[PDB]
Amino acid sequence: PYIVRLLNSSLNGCEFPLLTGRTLFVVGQSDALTASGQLPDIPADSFFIPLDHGGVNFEIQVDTDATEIILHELKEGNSESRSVQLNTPIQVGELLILIRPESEPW
Amino acid sequence: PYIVRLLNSSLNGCEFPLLTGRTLFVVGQSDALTASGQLPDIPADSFFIPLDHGGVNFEIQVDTDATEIILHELKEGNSESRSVQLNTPIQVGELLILIRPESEPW
Amino acid sequence: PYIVRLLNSSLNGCEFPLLTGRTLFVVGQSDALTASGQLPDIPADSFFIPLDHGGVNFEIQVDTDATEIILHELKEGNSESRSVQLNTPIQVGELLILIRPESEPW
Amino acid sequence: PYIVRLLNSSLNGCEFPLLTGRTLFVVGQSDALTASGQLPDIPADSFFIPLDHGGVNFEIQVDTDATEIILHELKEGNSESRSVQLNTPIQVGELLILIRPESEPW
Amino acid sequence: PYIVRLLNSSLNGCEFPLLTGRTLFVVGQSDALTASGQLPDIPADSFFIPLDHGGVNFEIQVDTDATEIILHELKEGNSESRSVQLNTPIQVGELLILIRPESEPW
Amino acid sequence: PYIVRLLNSSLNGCEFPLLTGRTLFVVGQSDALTASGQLPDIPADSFFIPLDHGGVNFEIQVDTDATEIILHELKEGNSESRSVQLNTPIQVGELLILIRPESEPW
Ligand SMILES: [Ca+2]
């Protein structure tokens, strides 16, 4: 399985496990956080990341096979889907992340 | 069953599952959120969505069959009903949502 | 069992179940909400409803028989009681509510 | 047993059970509330209330017999005690309370 | 066993049970409270007390025998200890507390 | 088993267990705290420590053997690693910490 690590933001170093399928990252200010509590405590498929400026929500999708990883950047009324590589910094809005095999520490 | 997906707001991407019968969405600023905690932690039939402008509460009704979905936009002392289709954006106040089957991600 | 539905306020559409005996609704601004957390998480007999203007605290009494429903507005150092009809809008200060049987959606 | 009812404030109508022995009421602004969560969820013996001005904490002691009720107002490094009666408004700081038998609503 | 009673602060009159061994009191503003939730819900060996100014964290140590009581005031990278007597106001920073036997009400 | 004790900050005195493997400490202001709630309630591998100035996120890795302890400071786009000792004050940015065997109180 794969892990998303933050390489910047006040949560730099935080590591989030990804489930097979879709994981949502909500990225933004106060208004989003306190409301994100709306989602149940089910095995976490959405996470909130605080960022004061330039935050863009995104999903990561890990195919059932774990052979392709797709990042869906969620813009106004549309999304931009990109193929992404492991163990490399990936910029999403003003956030910088890395996706690593669980067994390969960064 | 069906899932309500936000297509704008700070929570763009967030997905809320619908139960048979009735689910309420409270859409608005700070005053509503902190108070929405008043409702018990029972299987979630009301959700809060932050929106800084143009938020209008609405409830979705799904029949026992799960073949018809009606949205009721809640105005002052009254409501306005509309039939909805799956997989199509729906504008309620300034919020844009889409209703999808669980099995067809969007 | 009866349900109180809000017909206005930022919480328009919210529905609160009524227990036999007494249910209190505290209606007002920010100061009341954050402090209403003082009351335990026991089966809910008190609710907070935000209203920027004209909010009047009230309690509702359901007799053991469920044949009469009494509403008390909690004014300064006094209260004003009245019988209320089911399935009809009821104004309390500037809040508008409706009490319905759990079996009759509005 | 007995019930403490608030007869004024934004929280007019709130009812709290008095326990056998000693019950403490913490009265004041935001700073006290969020911190009152420090106390465990044991059968409630301290309770918080909000009051914008003149909030004085107080404790009520009830004898084994339930015939005497002593209220202690908690001032700086000292307390001022008085015997109180049932079903009679009692002023404590800016707050007006009333202590009633459970079986006798106000 | 022994109880810590607050003799000032917004929580004046609050009484915290002490366990044999070391109990931590974190005393300060908002930043500490919300983060104190980090500590597990194990039998409470930690308490948060709100104080807007002059708050100092401290530990109370009750030897296994319950014959000596030591307060450790926490400073930068070090602590300063003193023996404390029962039933007398103890100043820690701007907080005022009193340690009593459970059987001797203050 | 090893324990991290804070020797400064508003949480001076708080202690955090270290798990075998990796533990992250997020050290900063308000924005990080409220959002750190994003991480699940799984056996705690990240913790948040408030510090108004000079906070540096850092992670500690305890080898499977429990014979070496390595602390990594998480700077901008990079990390800095060093061996650290038990039972001695360790400066990490402006935080002061100490790591002890659980069996040896401090
Ligand atoms: Ca007596």
Author numbering:
A (entry chain E), B (entry chain D), C (entry chain C), D (entry chain B), E (entry chain A), F (entry chain F): 14 to 119
Article sentences:
The bacterial injectisome, or type III secretion system (T3SS), is a specialized syringe-shaped protein-export system utilized by many pathogenic Gram-negative bacteria for the injection of virulence proteins (effectors) into host cells. The injectisome can be divided into three major regions: the inner- (IM) and outer-membrane (OM) spanning basal body with associated export apparatus and ATPase components, an extracellular needle, and a terminating pore inserted into the host cell membrane called the translocon. The major structural scaffold of the basal body is comprised largely of three proteins that arrange into a series of highly oligomerized, concentric rings: two intimately associated proteins localized to the IM - PrgK/EscJ/MxiJ and PrgH/EscD/MxiG, and a third protein belonging to the secretin family of OM proteins, InvG/EscC/MxiD (Salmonella enterica serovar Typhimurium SPI-1, Enteropathogenic Escherichia coli (EPEC) LEE and Shigella dysenteriae nomenclature, respectively). In summary, we report the crystal structures for the cytoplasmic and periplasmic domains of PrgH and InvG, two of the main basal body components of the prototypical Salmonella SPI-1 injectisome.
A ∼20° subunit rotation in the hexamer of the crystal structure accommodates the tighter packing but superposition of the interface secondary structural units shows significant conservation with both interfaces having similar buried surface areas (640 Å2 vs. 546 Å2 for hexamer and 24mer respectively). Collectively, the crystallographic packing interfaces we observe support and mirror the low energy interfaces generated in our modelled basal body. This would be consistent with a model whereby the soluble domains have low-affinity interaction surfaces for oligomerization, which can be captured by the high concentration in the crystallization experiment. FHA domains are frequently involved in interaction with phosphothreonine (pThr)-modified proteins. In Shigella, the PrgH orthologue MxiG was reported to interact with phosphorylated peptides from the secretion apparatus protein Spa33 although a separate study failed to corroborate these results, and structures of the Yersinia orthologue YscD revealed an unconserved phosphothreonine binding motif. Protein sequence alignment of the PrgH orthologues indeed illustrates that the conserved residues involved in phosphopeptide binding in FHA domains are poorly conserved. To validate this, we engineered mutations of the PrgH residues corresponding to the proposed phosphothreonine interacting residues in MxiG - Arg35, Gln42 and Asp65 - to alanine. These mutations have no effect on in vivo secretion assays. We therefore conclude that the PrgH cytoplasmic domain is unlikely to interact with pThr-modified proteins. We note however that the FHA phosphopeptide interacting loops in our PrgH structure are accessible on the cytoplasmic face of the ring model, suggesting a potential interface for protein-protein interactions.
